[PDB]
């Protein structure tokens, strides 16, 4: 066929009920999660192909960067809560991985500010529990998939991206390969 499990894609002996429908996990310390979002902005062209009705989910991990890396899942659990996560993206992927100015939690919280979050707003927020559960929600979706790896994509909790098994000499056709993927498993 065109779209062979084990090309694009990859399917979960496991399957995972109640997943989202199209569920993206990352980390800002993550390379090619910086070239998905500055370079590819591979949600955004996902999201344009995809069908009516389908919600999608975005995701940080703890497996890197340690104490920093779980600052940033809390951090992005705020960004969620607060809805403001097309305004704090990039500067924390700059912040962490092109200028280095991220080095405690208080830098992450520095770049919220910066963005225009208030500070009061900012540090309720990160202490509420609404923001604890958000926690709980990014950690159990990627315990449900054994993640190690990241960027990562699920489509309905049973099929997995493939980007290894995709043209990258040219990026917007390797972008588009991509989403047109998400779409066929979306319709699957």
Same mark, same amino acid.
């Given at each position: 066929?065109? $779209?062979?499990?084990? @090309?694009?894609?990859?399917?979960?002996?496991?399957?995972?009920?109640?997943?989202?429908?199209?569920?993206?996990?990352?980390?800002?310390? #993550?390379?090619? #999660? $910086?070239?998905?979002?500055?370079?590819?902005?591979?949600?955004?062209?996902? @999201? @344009?192909?995809?069908?009516?009705?389908?919600?999608?989910?975005? /995701?940080? *991990?703890?497996?890197?960067?340690? +104490?920093?890396?779980? &600052?940033?899942?809390?951090?992005?659990?705020?960004?969620?809560?607060?809805?403001?996560? &097309?305004?704090?993206?990039?500067? %924390?992927?700059?912040?962490?991985?092109?200028?280095?100015?991220?080095? !405690?939690?208080?830098?992450?919280? &520095?770049?919220?500010?910066?963005?225009?979050?208030?500070?009061?707003? /900012? +540090?309720?927020?990160?202490?509420?529990?609404? *923001?604890?559960?958000?926690?709980?929600?990014?950690?159990?979706?990627?315990? +449900?998939?054994?993640?190690?790896?990241?960027?990562?994509?699920?489509?309905?909790?049973?099929?997995? %991206?493939?980007?290894?098994?995709? +043209?990258? !000499?040219?990026? &917007?056709?390797?972008?588009?390969? $991509?989403?047109?993927?998400?779409? /066929?498993?979306?319709? @699957?």
């Amino acid at each position: 066929a065109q $779209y062979e499990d084990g @090309k694009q894609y990859t399917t979960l002996e496991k399957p995972v009920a109640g997943a989202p429908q199209v569920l993206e996990f990352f980390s800002f310390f #993550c390379p090619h #999660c $910086y070239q998905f979002e500055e370079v590819l902005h591979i949600s955004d062209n996902v @999201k @344009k192909k995809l069908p009516e009705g389908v919600k999608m989910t975005k /995701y940080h *991990v703890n497996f890197m960067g340690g +104490d920093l890396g779980k &600052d940033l899942t809390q951090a992005w659990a705020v960004a969620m809560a607060l809805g403001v996560e &097309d305004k704090v993206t990039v500067p %924390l992927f700059e912040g962490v991985q092109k200028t280095q100015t991220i080095r !405690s939690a208080s830098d992450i919280r &520095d770049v919220f500010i910066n963005a225009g979050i208030k500070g009061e707003e /900012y +540090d309720a927020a990160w202490n509420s529990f609404v *923001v604890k559960s958000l926690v709980a929600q990014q950690e159990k979706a990627a315990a +449900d998939v054994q993640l190690r790896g990241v960027p990562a994509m699920f489509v309905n909790g049973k099929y997995q %991206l493939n980007p290894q098994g995709m +043209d990258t !000499s040219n990026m &917007d056709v390797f972008v588009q390969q $991509y989403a047109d993927t998400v779409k /066929y498993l979306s319709e @699957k």
